[PDB]
Amino acid sequence: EWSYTNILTGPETWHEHYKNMCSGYYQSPIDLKTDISTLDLKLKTVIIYRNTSSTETTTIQNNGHSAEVKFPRNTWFISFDGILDYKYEIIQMHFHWGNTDDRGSEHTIDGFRFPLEGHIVSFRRQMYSSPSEAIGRPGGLAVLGIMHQIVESIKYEQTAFKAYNNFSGVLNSQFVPPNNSTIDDINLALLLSLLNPSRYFRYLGSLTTPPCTENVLWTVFIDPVLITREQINLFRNLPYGSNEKQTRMGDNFRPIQLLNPIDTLASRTLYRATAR
Amino acid sequence: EWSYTNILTGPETWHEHYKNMCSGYYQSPIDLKTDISTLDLKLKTVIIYRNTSSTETTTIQNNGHSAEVKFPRNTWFISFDGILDYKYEIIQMHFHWGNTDDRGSEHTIDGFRFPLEGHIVSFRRQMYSSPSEAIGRPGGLAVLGIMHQIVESIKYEQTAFKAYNNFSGVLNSQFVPPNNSTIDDINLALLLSLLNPSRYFRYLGSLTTPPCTENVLWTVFIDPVLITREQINLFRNLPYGSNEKQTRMGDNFRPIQLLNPIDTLASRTLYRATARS
Ligand SMILES: NS(=O)(=O)c1ccc(CCNC(=S)N2CC(=O)N3CCc4ccccc4[C@H]3C2)cc1
Ligand SMILES: NS(=O)(=O)c1ccc(CCNC(=S)N2CC(=O)N3CCc4ccccc4[C@H]3C2)cc1
Ligand SMILES: *[C@@H]1O[C@H](CO)[C@@H](O)[C@H](O)[C@H]1NC(C)=O
Ligand SMILES: *[C@@H]1O[C@H](CO)[C@@H](O)[C@H](O)[C@H]1NC(C)=O
Ligand SMILES: [Zn+2]
Ligand SMILES: [Zn+2]
């Protein structure tokens, strides 16, 4: 009972249909404002790393609202502190994009929309033993936002689609909800190497789909990875679920939320990080 | 005399006109081959840092072959080891570009040319007390190569030209050689933050202009910084010097050299770096 493009179930209705927590005042996405952010030199380079003993397969699903890569358990990790001790475990990666190249991202940077934003979703394994235990609990989640920008001149091997192994060619008009397919694994360490993993915005916010749970540690990298126009078009061939009005999947992004709506009882701060 | 576009003085002649050292077997630029390169996990993230006590002015000149930013002494530094103890001191930054958007860089990455390559030139202050001591001596220099790529959709603030402060507007048809102008300082730390400073090729090579001295420790970052078509055409507004056949400055790049020409007496290796995973 939610959508992006059906005005009966669309993002303007979520605050009424999912008051816990889409009516809250720690919502995502936000406009990432360079001038109205606080630099915190203690925020360290982000590392993504794999358990080389893991052999289980990766899948991708058209879930009717996005293309969602589902990682197997105990395989991909994030470190924010330079220690490789499995504090954050990656669950899934999904995508938000536009009907057109001038929009698509959930977050903006100084009001600018990117054509594609990837969300790498992890749970705080340091505290919570499973995703199902973490997803609804305080401080459960950490999401990385990866901006993508379109370029006319580039070798395949230097695009984000190299790190995605082209989603093993699975993206087409017949990849219909709720189908999933097995795909070659995503090299998330290569993906992170395509941008500056020290240069990012950081804040406490929410899931950007219902029920908009206010338990997400957000990190949004300022530098985009690079893709081609042919590559963004592979996402736009996907069909939306039947609860949507638009036929082809696109404009699957939530509208911008305020950092501090007027009813907040404790203001949050937007932080930024850069290298030593 | 040398040039890029006069066939009498152009790059195919340098090996004869400047045999010391344009006839050498450790020449630059090279094709940076991802597959035929040795990953060395010991090569650390590059840092660029400023002496915040320096107040001296930056200038830029059209030297007849490039646009060259001349930094004041004791101002901008490179660290390859995480220590901020002034081992490498930056002297200047210049640029290589194309008549068209599909060429211009001196290095290639797996055969691919970028529209614009910037060269941040430093000397090994750790060993040599001045640029003029280091520039002609063994192991004297370290150059950073910064690839740039054109995007259609971007804010000024996320382009390389934010770090450059648009070179204070000096890139135009009236910026004739050998004119120099005072410019706002270049934020080289911001520039480096626009790419991944842990992801680079590394090798021992040469200056890419005569006399091609084989005393350069090369670092070429794999990820490009971003510019617009409007910004690349600003460089194309500069006039070449009177040594050149072409009027407008462009195609001011040296042809690709082999890592190991047939006559080499000791093969060099191309190294690659990536972030502590
Ligand atoms: N757009 S975003 O990045 O803000 C974002 C929005 C919304 C979500 C949805 C989170 N749900 C997700 S990621 N779910 C649902 C679930 O109940 N379980 C619990 C069961 C289970 C078991 C193994 C592995 C995974 C799971 C997750 C999957 C995640 C991320
Ligand atoms: N294309 S490249 O990156 O391989 C490359 C090619 C050629 C060079 C030019 C080297 N010359 C350069 S960088 N010169 C010449 C000189 O007489 N002195 C000595 C005096 C002096 C004093 C202060 C500050 C600078 C200097 C340099 C400037 C540098 C770099
Ligand atoms: C990527 O996948 C698409 C199908 O989604 C295919 O048409 C395209 O050629 C693929 N490109 C590769 C493997 O480079
Ligand atoms: C920093 O600048 C000051 C004054 O400009 C100078 O005296 C000092 O030597 C510089 N530091 C270094 C390490 O070069
Ligand atoms: Zn998302
Ligand atoms: Zn140069």
Author numbering:
A (entry chain BBB): 24 to 299
B (entry chain AAA): 24 to 300
The article reads:
For structural studies, we sought to complement ligand 35c with SmCA and hCA II in order to observe possible differences in the active site interactions. Initially, we solved the crystal structure of SmCA in the presence of 35c at a resolution of 1.79 Å observing a strong density inside the active site fully compatible with the inhibitor. The binding mode of 35c was the classical of this moiety anchoring the sulphonamide group through the catalytic zinc and displacing the water molecule. In addition, compound 35c formed the characteristic hydrogen bond with residue Thr231, stabilising the interaction. Several hydrophobic interactions are observed for both aromatic ring with side chains Val144 and Leu230 and the terminal portion of inhibitor with Ile114 and Pro154. From a superposition of the two complexes, we found no substantial differences occurring between the two complexes of SmCA and hCA II explaining the similar potency of action against the two different CAs. In addition, crystallographic analysis of the schistosome tegumental enzyme SmCA and human CA II complexed with a selection of these inhibitors showed the hydrophobic tails of the inhibitors is located in the both isoforms in the same hydrophobic task, explaining the lack of selectivity.
CAs are a superfamily of ubiquitous zinc metalloenzymes, present in all kingdoms of life, and encoded by at least eight distinct, evolutionarily unrelated gene families (designated α, β, γ, δ, ζ, η, θ and ι) converging in the same crucial reaction, the reverse hydration of CO2 to H+ and HCO3−15–18. CAs were shown to be essential for the worms to establish a robust infection in experimental animals and findings strongly suggests that chemical inhibition of CA from S. mansoni (SmCA) debilitate the worms and curtail the infection. Here, we report on the development of SmCA inhibitors conjugated to the PZQ scaffold as a possible novel therapeutic target for schistosomiasis. All compounds were evaluated for their inhibition profiles on both humans and Schistosoma CAs, X-ray crystal data of SmCA and hCA II in adduct with some inhibitors were obtained allowing the understanding of the main structural factors responsible of activity.
